[PDB]
Design a protein around this ligand. Structure first.
Ligand code: C8E
Ligand code: C8E
Lengths: 150, 758
C-alpha cells in the first residue's frame, strides 16, 4: 500500500520541450521523439520565443560490434553490440547538462544463413535504439535535481 | 598525470609584455655603462650593454653599430654588429653566441658558432651559423645539430649541413641529413622533411616491424600521399618472409557532400605457402578489396555502403588487418540507399555475402530489396503504421531455388495511459506472397514440397500493459517496481511450401521476451498463443541517478508455436507451459566498479541457454581492469545450429572467462595484459601481453598476442591451432604532439577485444 507514480514525474518545467539534433531523420532521433511522444511531452520547434522552454540536444551515437566469445576453431561464437549515445540538456540560464548512455546486447552468429543473421542484426539495432531512448528519458530527473543554488 | 607539464619544465615560460606586430619600426632603447664614437655612424657600447626593441631583448659585453650611406632613398641601412658574449632573447627563441650581426629593417639576424633553444615549446641545438631571415620567418641553420629532449641523456639528435625551419609553411627541411640515437649514426639521406604542423602531412615515412608465426618476419614501410584537405591516399609496402614477397596495401580516405568513405586494396602477387598448400593452379595471388561509405544528403537522403570482398576464403585467417580477422566467418557486401523523411521512409538495398569455407558457401543474396514505411501517429485515439517490402532472392549456387517475395503489413495501434500505468492494444496484419522458381532441382535431395505460386495471410492480436510502483528507502534512496504483461496471439498457417531465405532463431533477452517474432525476416512466422509476464525492480539514489536494476521474465505458452516445418532438435518434447525464462541485472555501486548480468534459460533444453556476466573496475579515462564470463550450453548449439553440433569444436558449446589488466607500474611504462580462457577444454583460447616506453620525444611499443586461429583435422579427434605474434612499433611524436599513451588502445587489438562495460 505504498505511494504510486515514481521515477520522478517528468518535470513540469519540461512538459513542453524542443528537440535538437544533427540528423533529425536518424533512427536515434525518431526513437527519442517517439519516446517523448509516449511520455506525453509536447514537441515545439525553435522558431517561437523560447525563453522558459529548455531543449534536448543529441550529440552523436556510436555502435560497437566486437567478438564476445569464440568456439574451439577460432571462429566467432557470438557478437556483442554496444550502442553509445551522447546527449545534453540545455536550460536557458542554467548552462548545460551532459547525458551519456550505453546499450549492451549480444547474439550468436551463423555464416550459413548470414542473410538471416543480417536481418536479425538490423532488428536488434532498432530495439537497441529504442531502449537507448528509454535510457535517455529516465535520466531526466537527474538533470532536474541538478538545478541547485550555489 | 599531465606529462605535458612535466615536459614543459625544461622549457622556458617567458614573461614580458607581448607586442602585437613586428619590432622593426619600433624605436631602439640602448642602456649601457660605456659608449664611444659617432652614434649614427660608428657607435661602440661596452660593459653590460642592454638593448631593447619591442620583443628584441639583447644583452652583451660589447656592441658595435656600423652604418653605410643609404643616401638618396631612403632609410638608414641600420646595421648592428656584435663582437663578443652575445646573448639574444625574444618571444620565440633564445640565442647564445660569440659573434653576431643584425639588420633591423628586414629583421635579418646572423649568429656565428652559437647555440639555440626554443621558448614556450621544446627544441634546442648547436649550429655553426644560426640565422633568422625573411622577417624572422625562415630560420636558416648552416652546419646545425638539432634535438628536442633537452637534458638528462643524449638519446637522439639530427645533424645536417643545411637545415631550414619555416614557420608559415610549418616545416623542418634538412639537407644531407644524418639521424643519430645519441652518438651513433644510422641513416643518411640527401634530403629529409620533419613536419612541425598538423594538417597536410606528406611527412617523410614512418615504418613498423612485426614477427608472426604464419608470415614470419614482417616489415612495413607505408607511404602517405595527401591530395586535398578532404581526401588522401596511403600506400603500404609490407614485406613478408615466409610468404616471400612484398604486399601492397592501398588505402584511400575521402570526404564529400555525398558523404565520407574509405577504400582499401591489399594485394600480394605471389605466395609460396599458399602455393604449396594449394597447388591445384599456378595462380597464387591473394588480394582484399574493401569499401565503406556513410552519407546523409539534405538530412532526408541516406547513402550507406559496406562492401568487403576477398580473393580466397583463407585470407583473413593468415593476414590480419583493421578490416578483418580470423574470427570472421564470412564477408559482407551490402549497398544501401534510402529516402527517410519523418512519417515516411523508403530504403532500397542489395545484400550479398561471401562465406569463408572451401565447400559450403550456399549463401543467398537479395537483389534488390525494397523497404517502405509510412506512419500516421494521430487517427483520433489510434496511431497507424504501414510496412511494405519487395525482395527478390537469388543464390550463388544454381541448384538452390530462387524467389520473389511481396510482403504487406499494416499495424493498427491504440495507446492508453493515465498515471500509475499504461495499456497498449496492437492489432497487426501480415500478408505475404511468394513467386518461387528453380524448385524441381531442390525438390529432390530432401523432403521438400515448394510450389511456384504461394501465399500466406496471418493476423495478429497483441495486448501490452505495465505499471509503476514506488517504495522509499534509507538516506534518500528510492526504489521502484515495474510489473509488465503482454499477451500475443497469431493463428497457425502451414508453411511447408515456403523456403527459408532470411529466417533463423533469435536470442531471448528480457526485452526480447516482449517481441512478437520467433524467427528473423518474414519467411517463418510461429503460431503465437502466449502470455509474457516480467518484473523490473530498479534502485535509485538521492541524486535521481539509477544505481541498481534487476529484471526477471517468464513466457507462458497455451499452445506450442508451430510454423509447419519445425525441425528443431529439442532434448525433450515439452509443448506447453512456462518454457522460456530470462533474467538481467546491473550494478554500479560507486563512481568506480560495477556489475552486469544476463541469463537465458529454457526448459526444453533442460539447461540454461545463455549466461553472461561482466564485472569491471573502471576509473574514468584510463588505467582499468575487467573480468567477464560467457556460457552457452551444448543443447543450445544442438537445437539452434544444426550440423554444427555434429562437429567436435562446436559440440561442447561455450564457457569462457575473459581477463583484462591495465594498471601502470611506473609513471612512464604502460603495462597491458589480457587472458581469455576456455573452461570446457581447459585450454587458453587467447592471451595478450604488451608494453610501451613513453619518454617524451619518442616511443617504442612491443606487443605479444597468442591466439587460436584454425582447427586441426585428423590427429586423435582434432585440436585447436595456436598462433603467436610479436609486434615492434615506433612512433616519434612530441612535435605536433597530442599523442603517446595508448591507455587502452593496446587492449582492443586481439581476436576478442576489450569493450567498455562501465
Ligand atoms: C654612471 C651612470 C651610467 C652611465 C650611463 C647612464 C645614462 C644612460 O645614458 C646613455 C645615453 O645614450 C642614450 C642613447 O639613446 C638611444 C636612443 O636614441 C638614439 C636614437 O633615437
Ligand atoms: C584522425 C587522423 C589523424 C589526425 C591527423 C590528420 C588530421 C585529421 O583530419 C584528416 C582527415 O580529415 C579530413 C579533413 O576534413 C575535411 C575538411 O575539409 C572539408 C571541407 O570541404
Amino acid at each position: 500500500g505504498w505511494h504510486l507514480r515514481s521515477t520522478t514525474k517528468v518535470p513540469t518545467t519540461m512538459k513542453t520541450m524542443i528537440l535538437q539534433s544533427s540528423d533529425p531523420n536518424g533512427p536515434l532521433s525518431r526513437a527519442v521523439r517517439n519516446q517523448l511522444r509516449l511520455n506525453g511531452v509536447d514537441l515545439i520547434d525553435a522558431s517561437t520565443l523560447r525563453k522558459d522552454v529548455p531543449s534536448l540536444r543529441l550529440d552523436g551515437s556510436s555502435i560497437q560490434k566486437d567478438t564476445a566469445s569464440v568456439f574451439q576453431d577460432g571462429r566467432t561464437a557470438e557478437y556483442q553490440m554496444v550502442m553509445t549515445v551522447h546527449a545534453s540538456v540545455l536550460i536557458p540560464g542554467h548552462d548545460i547538462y551532459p547525458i551519456t548512455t550505453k546499450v549492451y546486447r549480444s547474439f550468436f552468429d551463423n555464416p550459413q544463413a548470414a542473410l538471416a543473421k543480417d536481418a536479425e542484426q538490423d532488428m536488434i539495432i532498432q530495439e537497441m535504439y529504442d531502449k537507448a531512448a528509454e535510457q535517455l528519458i529516465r535520466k531526466l530527473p537527474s538533470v532536474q535535481v541538478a538545478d541547485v543554488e550555489a | 598525470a599531465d606529462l605535458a607539464t612535466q615536459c614543459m619544465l625544461g622549457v622556458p615560460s617567458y614573461d614580458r609584455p607581448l607586442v602585437e606586430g613586428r619590432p622593426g619600426d619600433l624605436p631602439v632603447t640602448i642602456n649601457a655603462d660605456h659608449a664611444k664614437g659617432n652614434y649614427p655612424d660608428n657607435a661602440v657600447f661596452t660593459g653590460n650593454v642592454d638593448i631593447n626593441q619591442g620583443n628584441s631583448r639583447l644583452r652583451a659585453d660589447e656592441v658595435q653599430l656600423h652604418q653605410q650611406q643609404a643616401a638618396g632613398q631612403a632609410q638608414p641601412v641600420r646595421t648592428v654588429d656584435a663582437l663578443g658574449n652575445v646573448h639574444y632573447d625574444d618571444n620565440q627563441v633564445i640565442l647564445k653566441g660569440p659573434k653576431a650581426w643584425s639588420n633591423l629593417n628586414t629583421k635579418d639576424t646572423n649568429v656565428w658558432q652559437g647555440d639555440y633553444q626554443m621558448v614556450g615549446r621544446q627544441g634546442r641545438g648547436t649550429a655553426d651559423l644560426m640565422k633568422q631571415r625573411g622577417e624572422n620567418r625562415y630560420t636558416i641553420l648552416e652546419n646545425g645539430s638539432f634535438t628536442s629532449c633537452l637534458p638528462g641523456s643524449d638519446t637522439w639528435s639530427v645533424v645536417g649541413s643545411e637545415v631550414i625551419h619555416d614557420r608559415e609553411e610549418q616545416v623542418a627541411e634538412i639537407w644531407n641529413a644524418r639521424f643519430k640515437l645519441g652518438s651513433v649514426p644510422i641513416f643518411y639521406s640527401p634530403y629529409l622533411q620533419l613536419p612541425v604542423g598538423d594538417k597536410r602531412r606528406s611527412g617523410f615515412l614512418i615504418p613498423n616491424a612485426k614477427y608472426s608465426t604464419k608470415n614470419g618476419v614482417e616489415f612495413s614501410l607505408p607511404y602517405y600521399w595527401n591530395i586535398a584537405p578532404n581526401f588522401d591516399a596511403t600506400i603500404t609496402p609490407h614485406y613478408m618472409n615466409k610468404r616471400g614477397g612484398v604486399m601492397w596495401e592501398n588505402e584511400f580516405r575521402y570526404l564529400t557532400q555525398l558523404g565520407s568513405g574509405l577504400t582499401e586494396f591489399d594485394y600480394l602477387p605471389s605466395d609460396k605457402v599458399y602455393e604449396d598448400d594449394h597447388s591445384s593452379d599456378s595462380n597464387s595471388r591473394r588480394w582484399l578489396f574493401y569499401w565503406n561509405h556513410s552519407g546523409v544528403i539534405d538530412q532526408v537522403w541516406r547513402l550507406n555502403a559496406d562492401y568487403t570482398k576477398v580473393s580466397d576464403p583463407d585470407y583473413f585467417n593468415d593476414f590480419s588487418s583493421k578490416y578483418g580477422s580470423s574470427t570472421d566467418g564470412y564477408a559482407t557486401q551490402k549497398f544501401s540507399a534510402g529516402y527517410v523523411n519523418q512519417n515516411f521512409d523508403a530504403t532500397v538495398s542489395t545484400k550479398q555475402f561471401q562465406v569463408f569455407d572451401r565447400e559450403s558457401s550456399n549463401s543467398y543474396s537479395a537483389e534488390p530489396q525494397l523497404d517502405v514505411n509510412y506512419y500516421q501517429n494521430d487517427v483520433g485515439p489510434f496511431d497507424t503504421h504501414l510496412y511494405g517490402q519487395v525482395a527478390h532472392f537469388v543464390n550463388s549456387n544454381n541448384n538452390m531455388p530462387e524467389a520473389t517475395r511481396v510482403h504487406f503489413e499494416p499495424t493498427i495501434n491504440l495507446p492508453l495511459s493515465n498515471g500509475w500505468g499504461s495499456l497498449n492494444t496492437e492489432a497487426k496484419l501480415l500478408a505475404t506472397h511468394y513467386q518461387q522458381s528453380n524448385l524441381d532441382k531442390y525438390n529432390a535431395a530432401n523432403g521438400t514440397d515448394y510450389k511456384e505460386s504461394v501465399s500466406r495471410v496471418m493476423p495478429q492480436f497483441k495486448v501490452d500493459g505495465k505499471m509503476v510502483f514506488e517504495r522509499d528507502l534509507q538516506e534518500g534512496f528510492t526504489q521502484t517496481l515495474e510489473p509488465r504483461v503482454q499477451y500475443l496471439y497469431v493463428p497457425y498457417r502451414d508453411q511447408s511450401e515456403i523456403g527459408n531465405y532470411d529466417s533463423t532463431l533469435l536470442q531471448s533477452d528480457y526485452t526480447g521476451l516482449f517481441r512478437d517474432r520467433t524467427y528473423s525476416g518474414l519467411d517463418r512466422i510461429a503460431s503465437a498463443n502466449q502470455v509474457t509476464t516480467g518484473l523490473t525492480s530498479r534502485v535509485y539514489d538521492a541524486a535521481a541517478v539509477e544505481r541498481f536494476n534487476i529484471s526477471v521474465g517468464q513466457i507462458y505458452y497455451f499452445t506450442e508455436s508451430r510454423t509447419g516445418d519445425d525441425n528443431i532438435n529439442w532434448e525433450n518434447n515439452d509443448t506447453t507451459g512456462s518454457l522460456v525464462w530470462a533474467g538481467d541485472t546491473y550494478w554500479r555501486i560507486a563512481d568506480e566498479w560495477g556489475l552486469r548480468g544476463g541469463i537465458q534459460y529454457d526448459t526444453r533444453l533442460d539447461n540454461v541457454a545463455t549466461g553472461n556476466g561482466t564485472i569491471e573496475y573502471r576509473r574514468d579515462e584510463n588505467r582499468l581492469v575487467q573480468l567477464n564470463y560467457r556460457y552457452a550450453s551444448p543443447e543450445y548449439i544442438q537445437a539452434t545450429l544444426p550440423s554444427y553440433s555434429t562437429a567436435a569444436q562446436y559440440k561442447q558449446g561455450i564457457s569462457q572467462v575473459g581477463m583484462t589488466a591495465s594498471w601502470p607500474i611506473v609513471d612512464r611504462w604502460s603495462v597491458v595484459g589480457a587472458y581469455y580462457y576456455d573452461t570446457n577444454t581447459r585450454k587458453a583460447a587467447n592471451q595478450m601481453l604488451g608494453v610501451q616506453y613513453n619518454s617524451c620525444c619518442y616511443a617504442i611499443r612491443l606487443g605479444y598476442e597468442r591466439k587460436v586461429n584454425g582447427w586441426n583435422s585428423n590427429d586423435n579427434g582434432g585440436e585447436s591451432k595456436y598462433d603467436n605474434t610479436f609486434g615492434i612499433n615506433i612512433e616519434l611524436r612530441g612535435l605536433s604532439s597530442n599523442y603517446g599513451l595508448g591507455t587502452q588502445q593496446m587492449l582492443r587489438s586481439n581476436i576478442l577485444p576489450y569493450q567498455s562495460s562501465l
